[PDB]
Amino acid sequence: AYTNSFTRGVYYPDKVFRSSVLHSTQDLFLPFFSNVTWFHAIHDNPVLPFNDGVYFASTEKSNIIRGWIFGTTLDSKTQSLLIVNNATNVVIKVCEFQFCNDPFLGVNCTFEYVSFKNLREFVFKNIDGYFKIYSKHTPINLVRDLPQGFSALEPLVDLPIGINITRFQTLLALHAYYVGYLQPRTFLLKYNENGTITDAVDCALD
Amino acid sequence: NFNFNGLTGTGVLTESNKKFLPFQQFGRDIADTTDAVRDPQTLEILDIT
Numbered sequence: 528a529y530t531n532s533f534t535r536g537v538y539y540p541d542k543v544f545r546s547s548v549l550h551s552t553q554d555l556f557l558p559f560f561s562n563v564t565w566f567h568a569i570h571d572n573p574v575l576p577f578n579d580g581v582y583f584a585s586t587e588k589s590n591i592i593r594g595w596i597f598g599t600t601l602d603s604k605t606q607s608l609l610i611v612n613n614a615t616n617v618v619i620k621v622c623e624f625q626f627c628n629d630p631f632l633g634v635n636c637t638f639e640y641v642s643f644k645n646l647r648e649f650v651f652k653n654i655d656g657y658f659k660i661y662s663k664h665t666p667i668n669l670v671r672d673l674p675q676g677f678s679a680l681e682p683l684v685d686l687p688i689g690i691n692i693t694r695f696q697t698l699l700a701l702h703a704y705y706v707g708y709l710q711p712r713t714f715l716l717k718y719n720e721n722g723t724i725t726d727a728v729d730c731a732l733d
Numbered sequence: 734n735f736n737f738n739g740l741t742g743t744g745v746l747t748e749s750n751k752k753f754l755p756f757q758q759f760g761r762d763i764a765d766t767t768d769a770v771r772d773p774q775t776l777e778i779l780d781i782t
């Protein structure tokens with residue numbers, strides 16, 4: 528299934544502060560009004576590709592999704608990144624750790640790091656040797672679709688991993704999300720007086 | 734003369750009222766000059782004039 532992304536998916540492009548200014552920047556963004564593939568939870572684990580970057584949004588309260596896997600040959604024979612909500616803390620590990628082809632739990636490693644009324648958005652991108660994570664958490668009432676609205680993402684973590692990626696998978700557990708790819712675009716962001724991006728223009732749109 | 738992490742220049746430092754997000758290190762002006770910098774050894778945020 529598919530559904531348009533209205534405008535959300537924009538993130539603070541750099542680590543620099545700006546206020547009350549219209550700033551133009553070229554970067555990997557999710558173009559406005561592009562379809563984003565829609566998935567729902569039952570039983571299976573659908574496959575997804577990965578190029579340039581990805582924007583990944585979800586809505587849930589039972590922690591149905593615990594994390595993610597990223598890599599090229601995911602079946603435990605090359606270096607791959609695993610993100611998981613440990614129990615309350617979030618852990619990231621780059622290793623060739625053993626997986627099934629559709630892993631889920633019940634109720635040579637190289638890198639380690641530790642940390643439906645709500646909707647959580649993320650952006651993952653591998654550029655300049657770094658793996659960069661951006662996120663936003665927001666209360667919502669539209670359990671069905673990512674709402675018509677706007678809010679910028681800010682980085683959660685910025686790792687110097689530098690591995691190759693062509694695929695990724697979501698991770699669940701045994702006891703409703705959207706994914707869309709980024710493209711290089713030139714954007715115009717309006718930084719308000721307090722320094723927060725309040726609106727943006729994807730001016731390759733029309 | 735001020736030097737924060739190699740960002741070097743001359744100016745008068747003052748306490749800043751800008752609300753930097755936790756991942757931001759300096760504020761860049763319209764002329765592409767740093768008008769605000771975080772003290773590397775503190776949470777303090779200082780304005781350059």
Ligand SMILES: *[C@@H]1O[C@H](CO)[C@@H](O[C@@H]2O[C@H](CO)[C@@H](O)[C@H](O)[C@H]2NC(C)=O)[C@H](O)[C@H]1NC(C)=O
Pocket residue numbers: 599600691692693
């Ligand atoms: C990352 O690894 C994948 C393989 O997992 C590489 O895929 C190759 O891409 C080239 C592009 O021209 C193809 O010709 C090859 O046939 C692909 N190989 C396979 C096995 O699919 C990819 O090139 C790698 N990229 C980086 C940046 O390391």
Ligand SMILES: *[C@@H]1O[C@H](CO)[C@@H](O)[C@H](O)[C@H]1NC(C)=O
Pocket residue numbers: 529560561562
């Ligand atoms: C994606 O969106 C375009 C218009 O934005 C539409 O023409 C196309 O059919 C959509 N893709 C699918 C698979 O429906």
Ligand SMILES: *[C@@H]1O[C@H](CO)[C@@H](O)[C@H](O)[C@H]1NC(C)=O
Pocket residue numbers: 613614
């Ligand atoms: C959290 O992580 C630590 C270290 O990896 C582990 O010992 C602990 O068991 C984890 N939490 C739970 C509830 O298992």
Ligand SMILES: *[C@@H]1O[C@H](CO)[C@@H](O)[C@H](O)[C@H]1NC(C)=O
Pocket residue numbers: 635
């Ligand atoms: C990975 O583990 C295997 C043993 O299963 C070992 O032979 C190999 O040297 C290790 N490192 C790499 C890069 O394969």
Ligand SMILES: *[C@@H]1O[C@H](CO)[C@@H](O)[C@H](O)[C@H]1NC(C)=O
Pocket residue numbers: 719721
């Ligand atoms: C800006 O931040 C101040 C903090 O005191 C707050 O009172 C004000 O409402 C904020 N305004 C906007 C537009 O974010």
Ligand SMILES: *[C@@H]1O[C@H](CO)[C@@H](O)[C@H](O)[C@H]1NC(C)=O
Pocket residue numbers: 774775
């Ligand atoms: C570094 O500076 C901080 C002040 O922010 C101080 O508390 C800390 O003790 C200093 N480092 C060491 C090793 O003392």
